[PDB]
């Protein structure tokens, strides 16, 4: 963990991102069982009979916000981890994966908790902009080791 | 690869479930061509005529198998990778590699083999369970070299 | 950056492809929008009113762009970096490389322009097959040090 000093920040940044996500889907099965919605007709008649095998806003939701987790911490989980090994300053570095940090959990705090527009799409802006940055750092050293 | 003794298994079992997740993908077009069931206008029109640009309940099963497979392997990619450069017992290391891998094998013949639930969930549950102990160990690393 | 010879390419590559994909949530954002078809129902008052709170087909193809992104280049993030430092050729490196970011642009290209079938498939194809060399090539490195 010491073969770059951002990399402890980084490391403890993703990490916690990924158990959030962790969270987000056991949230995600709460609710299936809490409404009995499911997606497929066997899980239905375990939990109740066929007619529980049905959309429901709530899931619907939850998934949406999986799924954008996925779009951005995972890219980030990339981006970040090269981005430690490319020596940028410390502090930085550290603002960098804060503000990552800090915007995704404030998105899924506004998309679960159906928070008014625009909180979810300014926290989701908010946690591009590192990403945005770290992509164009590393895009310029790999130019530049060619 | 010998960078650390756990590594080379690490890399096995993620390589074969990247392959495992291709098969999915495979297998989710063969679906769609079987049971004519397409995404796209345009693919559809190849393939028969503009009414088959329609949702299919086994088609829609294998998005979700799919999209499951990216919710947990991915993390996976992530966790294991770091995991295995803490030093871990080189069996123990082995044995949360073995348990991903079977779970989540198992996961998708539950899945794509409509077994009766709870199967397919306990495979889920199982799998997850390594995760969730490398994202601790990781955590710890993390926090302990800030 | 310079840890082995066919590194730079790799980040290069995967560096426009993740920048790549950042460009078609911007545009799914963007078509949104235009087409006032929200997902949320605080995105719909925000913007019109809950009628705006619907699903839109240039919208849904946006998002299964955006998903078939994330099911073949987020792998490729994954097989391309380890593969980077199992010491191949760095010509057939660049060459993996290359035709995976071709192959995937163009994908993009096609599945947004709603260009003919099969175009988009054999685009899809096409930069299926480094990704496959890749993870046999992995495979086989991992295997023999075990
Ligand atoms: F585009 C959409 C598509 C679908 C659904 C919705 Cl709800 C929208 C949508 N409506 C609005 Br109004 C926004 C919006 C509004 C504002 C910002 C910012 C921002 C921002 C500005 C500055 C910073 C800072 F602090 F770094 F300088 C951070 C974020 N992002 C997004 N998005
Ligand atoms: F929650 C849901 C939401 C939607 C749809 C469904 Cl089908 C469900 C759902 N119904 C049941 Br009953 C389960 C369930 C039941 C059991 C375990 C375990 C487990 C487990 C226990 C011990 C181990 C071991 F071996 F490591 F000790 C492994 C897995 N997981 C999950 N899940
Ligand atoms: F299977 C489907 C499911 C759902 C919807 C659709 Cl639209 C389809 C589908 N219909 C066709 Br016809 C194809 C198709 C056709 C051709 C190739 C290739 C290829 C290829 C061959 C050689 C190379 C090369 F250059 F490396 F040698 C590359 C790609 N891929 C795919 N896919
Ligand atoms: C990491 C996971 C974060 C979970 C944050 C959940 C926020 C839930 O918050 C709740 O949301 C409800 C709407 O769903 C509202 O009715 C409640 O007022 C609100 O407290
Ligand atoms: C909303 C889209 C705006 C893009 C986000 C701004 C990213 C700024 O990123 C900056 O780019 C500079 C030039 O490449 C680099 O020198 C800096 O190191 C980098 O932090
Ligand atoms: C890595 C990919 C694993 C593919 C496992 C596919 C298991 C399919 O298995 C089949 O599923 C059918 C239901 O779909 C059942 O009707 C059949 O009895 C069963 O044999
Ligand atoms: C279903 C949710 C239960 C969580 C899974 C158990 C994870 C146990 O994980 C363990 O955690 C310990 C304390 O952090 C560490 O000392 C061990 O190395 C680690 O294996
Ligand atoms: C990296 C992002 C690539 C974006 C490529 C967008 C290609 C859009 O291209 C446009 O698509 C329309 C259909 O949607 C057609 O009607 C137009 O003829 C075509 O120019
Ligand atoms: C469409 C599915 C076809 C599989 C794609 C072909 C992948 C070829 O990949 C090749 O495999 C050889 C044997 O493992 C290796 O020796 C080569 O290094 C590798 O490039
Ligand atoms: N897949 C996204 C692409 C753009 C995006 O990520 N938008 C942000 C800001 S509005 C968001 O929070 N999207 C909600 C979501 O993805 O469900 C979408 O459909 O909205
Ligand atoms: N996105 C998941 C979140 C929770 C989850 O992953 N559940 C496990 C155990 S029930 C599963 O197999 N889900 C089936 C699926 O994701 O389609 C869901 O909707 O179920
Ligand atoms: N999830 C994919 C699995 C197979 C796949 O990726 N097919 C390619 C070639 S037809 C594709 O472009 N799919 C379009 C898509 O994923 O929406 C699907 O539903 O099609």
């Excluded at 954008?68 to 430690?84: C, K, R």
Aim: charged share 15%; hydrophobic share 50%; proline share 7%.
């Amino acid at each position: 963990v010491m073969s770059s000093p951002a990399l402890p920040a980084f490391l403890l940044c993703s990490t916690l991102l990924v158990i959030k996500m962790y969270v987000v889907a056991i949230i995600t099965g709460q609710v299936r069982l809490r409404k009995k919605a499911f997606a497929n007709p066997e899980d239905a008649l375990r939990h109740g009979g066929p007619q529980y095998c049905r959309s429901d806003p709530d899931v619907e939701r939850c998934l949406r916000a999986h799924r954008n987790d996925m779009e951005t911490i995972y890219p980030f989980l990339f981006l970040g981890f090269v981005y430690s090994f490319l020596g940028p300053n410390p502090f930085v570095a550290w603002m960098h994966f804060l503000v990552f940090l800090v915007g995704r959990v404030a998105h899924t705090v506004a998309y679960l908790g159906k928070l008014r527009a625009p909180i979810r799409s300014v926290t989701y802006t908010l946690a591009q902009l590192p990403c945005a940055s770290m992509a164009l750092q590393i895009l310029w050293e790999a130019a530049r080791h060619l």
